[PDB]
Amino acid sequence: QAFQRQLTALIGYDVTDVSNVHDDELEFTRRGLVTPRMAEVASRDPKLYAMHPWVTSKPLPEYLWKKIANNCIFIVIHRSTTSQTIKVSPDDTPGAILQSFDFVLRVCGRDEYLVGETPIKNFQWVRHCLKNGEEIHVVLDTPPDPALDEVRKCDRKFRVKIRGIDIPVLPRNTDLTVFVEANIQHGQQVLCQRRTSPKPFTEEVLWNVWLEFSIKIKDLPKGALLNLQIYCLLYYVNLLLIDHRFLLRRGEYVLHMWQISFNADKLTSATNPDKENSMSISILLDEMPNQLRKQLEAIIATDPLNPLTAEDKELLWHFRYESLKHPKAYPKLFSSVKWGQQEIVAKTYQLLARREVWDQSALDVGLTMQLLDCNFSDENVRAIAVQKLESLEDDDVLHYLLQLVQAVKFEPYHDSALARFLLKRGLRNKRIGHFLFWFLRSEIAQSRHYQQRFAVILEAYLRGCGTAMLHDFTQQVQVIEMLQKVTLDIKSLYDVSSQVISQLKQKLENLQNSQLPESFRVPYDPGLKAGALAIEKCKVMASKKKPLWLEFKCADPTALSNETIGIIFKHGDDLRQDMLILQILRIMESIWETESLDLCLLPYGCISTGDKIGMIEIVKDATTIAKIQQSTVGNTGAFKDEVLNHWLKEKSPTEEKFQAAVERFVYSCAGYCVATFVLGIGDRHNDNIMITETGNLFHIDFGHILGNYRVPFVLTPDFLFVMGTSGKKTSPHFQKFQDICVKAYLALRHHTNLLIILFSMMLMTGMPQLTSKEDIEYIRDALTVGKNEEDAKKYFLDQIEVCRDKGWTVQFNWFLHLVLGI
Ligand SMILES: Cn1ncc2c(NCCCS(C)(=O)=O)nc(-c3cccc4n[nH]cc34)nc21
Structure with a gap:
């Protein structure tokens, strides 16, 4: 019993509760899913499931091959204090490297394993290292005990009677009229539609009317929806005309409705849980x-x-x-x-x-x-x-x-x-x-x-x-709940006064001491195991939503670097929109990977954990584009062209690395112009754009531009300056940028149908406000559907030139709106 209790707390909802049902589909589904569960559980290899090897069968990209000298790849193995390197061939297995050197090769600081009968090159962690030019360090220790993963043991026309609608209290809008619209839907395709005669809008409206439809009962398709809507469109609710047993829905129904075009929520068969405030409608099926x-x-x-x-x-x-x-x-x-x-x-x-x-x-x-x-x-x-x-x-x-x-x-x-x-x-x-x-x-x-x-x-x-994962989830959930409380309490208290910075570090002190789990898995990065907070580095951020800047230590002793784990906790925005945008970015990368193209995107971790609240991965050594300009000139939006190029030379010790940053910048800048144009979110304030000390550019806070949704994107003169250009000029780097863009762009167009369906789905299930027929059909134009590669190529290059013809115009404008209030 304390088990179903634990599940409920981990889930955040009681699945045994039956207060909001009119049939047994949900319970029926709990039973039906048992088979599928036991089937997969009773056939997964304990060892491989415990170590969860993260591998791929895709070929190694061209840009990652040129990163290899020979058929040689070095791997530093560690045991206790001893430590030695090893020469390896990209094609040999983890088992081969072992005898070349029962234990297993776990990555340092991570709950990640290099195991299984796959080439060393077909591991994601190895590829991650190569891309970033990092070195593969693994510690040799024993495999996790698979036991820890143990699991607890007929020809009639269809008709529906509309009895009436009841609402405890109706809006202060006197006085209007209401009629009910009953649609028989399938897909979003309405098969037949009937309405009731209008009626004065009171807290109780009775029709007692039979709505006879044109469609015969036998012609009703499985999955068809009886869509009931109220117009003055104020309310809607759905009822599957054919239930989960192929039975024709019959009898009395009192459905509590949802209050308010392509939104997925409008499709749900769930009734409104709020029975005391919600509009109700009474029908009869026979x-x-x-x-x-x-x-x-x-x-x-x-x-x-x-x-x-x-x-x-x-x-x-x-x-x-x-x-x-x-x-x-x-x-x-x-x-x-x-x-x-x-x-x-x-x-x-x-x-x-x-x-x-x-x-x-x-x-x-x-x-x-x-x-x-x-x-x-x-x-x-x-x-x-x-x-x-x-x-x-x-x-x-x-x-x-x-x-x-x-x-x-x-x-x-x-x-x-x-x-x-x-x-x-x-x-x-x-x-x-x-x-x-x-x-x-x-x-x-x-x-x-x-x-x-x-x-x-x-x-x-x-x-x-x-058992093992149920415990991790429990720890992760506990931590998230505690921190959210703090983020909310802190938010209630401009400048981040001492009284608040004291309160924060104070609150964190109370938690860490005998309250928060000694260690927990980083939700956006399962491998990472976070330990104790570093209160000293923790702070409330200069953001209008007072997000928490948190930093933890890595609970893993075998961890190499001493770098803390940075996490941003934030309430105020729906981070789900951010998730979808970041996920698309990863999809765009994988796509570009098939073409062997590598724009250097930084799809940082982002997990929605609650209502308008979630966590964000803190990218290391990164700062705002706006902040790099607030240094030179603060209160006034007197943006200067050269500042960005200065900032880079400053952060790159060897001038060589600088040229690498200017390159990383040109790659990362093109990828974000293309990816952001296709998604129609390229017009951002430079405050929502960051750059690494290594020259890696990347956008942020996507929930902001989607919660309040004119230049094609952001290619400001300061970026252009870094490329060695100003005004009526060119370069050896700008030509490069324009070169990569048309490449990146043309490549995406080779997957038009994929992007379109994902974009369309993103809008319907994640952007409730951006769900119109026109909102969706934006990406068609952006991807210049049905156009020569030549035309499209020009189309984008025009977009670039439009950012040139604008300079700081829109940026300054943003400065008027966001920075101050014009
Ligand atoms: C992903 N990432 N890495 C660093 C960083 C950051 N750094 C804060 C320091 C900026 S500064 C002090 O240089 O101006 N802020 C944000 C961020 C802030 C607010 C809203 C966001 N949504 N998505 C990411 C958001 N994300 C960040």
Whole structure:
């Protein structure tokens, strides 16, 4: 019992609670997930699961090959005080290196292991070292005891009666009228729509009206939603017309509704938990011709957001067997399906049974993701997408985990192939499981629309993750809860007075002494194990949301460097938006990796842990672009061109390193101009832009520009100065920048459909305010869909020149708005 209690505290929600249900789908899902859990648990290798080797099967990039002398790679092994280097070949296994040198090779300071039958080059930690030009240091010790991971042992027209609506208290807006709109939805595609006669808007409105729809009962598709909405659009709520047992929903229902276009929340089957304040509604249920081929291929070629006309759909359907031969035609083909007709759906299933071309096609994530969005409610359609995902290596799963977790919001039922898939992969791998936990917990904490479903999924995971991880989560959760309290208490108290800096270090003193865990895993970096705080370095930050600047020691003695673990705790913004933006950045990098391109992005760790509150990784040796200018000229926005180049020469001791910084800067600057333009978040105040002492540029605080959402992006003259240019001039570096940009840009366009679906999904599940048809179709233009590589190339170069023609104009403007208040 104290176990289900522990689960509830780790989850942040009671999954056994049944106060907010009108059926047993949630409980049914708890039971159904048991099998999938035990199946994955009872078939994972204890040793490999305990050490969770982080590896990849992708080729080693060109830019990481040129980092290797010979077929040689050095690795420093450590034991007690002894310590020796070793010459290794990129292609030999960890076992080989051992005999070349029962113990195992663990990385210093990290809970990371170099184990398994894979080349030494196919490890992420090794590749990380090479990229950063770091040296691989491992300590030789015994493998973690796999025991520590032990797990606790019929032809009628459909009709619905609208009894009426009840609300305890209605807005002070006298006086208006209300009618109820009942839609039978599927995908976001409304099959049939009926309304009630308007009625005076009182706290109780009774119609007692039968709304007879055009669609026969037998023609109702599994997963179809009875969407009930109130107009003056004030309220909405949904009811699956066909339940989780293939039964036709029947009987009396009193649904509490959500108060207020492409938002995923509008899809939920969850009813509003707040029964005392929410609006309530009461209902009662009782050889193809040459030309046509071209036309079809042109249709199949268009982007995911390109709308299908009636003719387009009729064509796709009539030639469905020809369309079936094109995996890329699936999303559009299944959109051309009349789900409101049982005969058609039946034929669609007959079609799916002929999945030779699909089953054999190479995995296209962008394509797979499309079948998992709000446009598809059929579980058989969505199942083939999940099928293709099964072939993903744990490496790629981590890449798309966040948005796969978000895609669960588009599932009609709590129990889905997507859910079970995430459950399985999370249980198969500790790293995946770790992030799955936080991603789900993130949603469960600030999403009433989906907390129930995600809570049931999280519970299933926790019951199979193992004793060891359950303990880590417990420590991580405890720490986060304590620090959040401090961040809130501190926020309640401009300049960070002594009275507050004293209070902070004071509060931290109270916690550290006999309260906070002696050690905990860094949520955004599972390998790292944080120890005791360094109160001296801790401070409240000069931010309008008074974020905590915290620094910990590494609990790992074998750790090499003495550098502390820096974490920023912050309340005020929804960090989920930041997560999605940062995750996309990693996706853009992996993409660029396939092309062997390396823009030096810094997708720092960021984890949403609660309501408008989460933690951020502190990148070391970095400062604001604005701060580097506030030094030269403070109160006035008198930005000077050369200051940035000065700051670098200053921080780089050997002038050589300086040239390396100016290079790192040109790479990092191009990557952020391209990546930021595609995402339409490139117009930022230089306060939201930082640079490393090594010249690595990177944006920050993405939740800020998305919470209040004119130059294409930020290529200010001070950046240009570092590139050796001013005004009507060029360079050997600027040409380089313009060179890398067009490269980086053109490369992204080779994955247009992937970016589009991710961007679209990001907006619907993460940016509730940015959910219009126009908001989404921005990335189409940004990626200049359907354009020659030449045209596109020019398009971006125009964008660059527009930043030139602007100089400090917008920056200064930002200075007027943010800095002061104009
Ligand atoms: C990721 N990272 N690394 C350093 C750093 C930082 N450094 C603070 C020092 C800046 S200074 C003192 O040089 O002006 N501030 C922030 C940051 C602050 C506020 C909101 C944010 N959202 N996302 C990141 C945010 N992120 C940072």
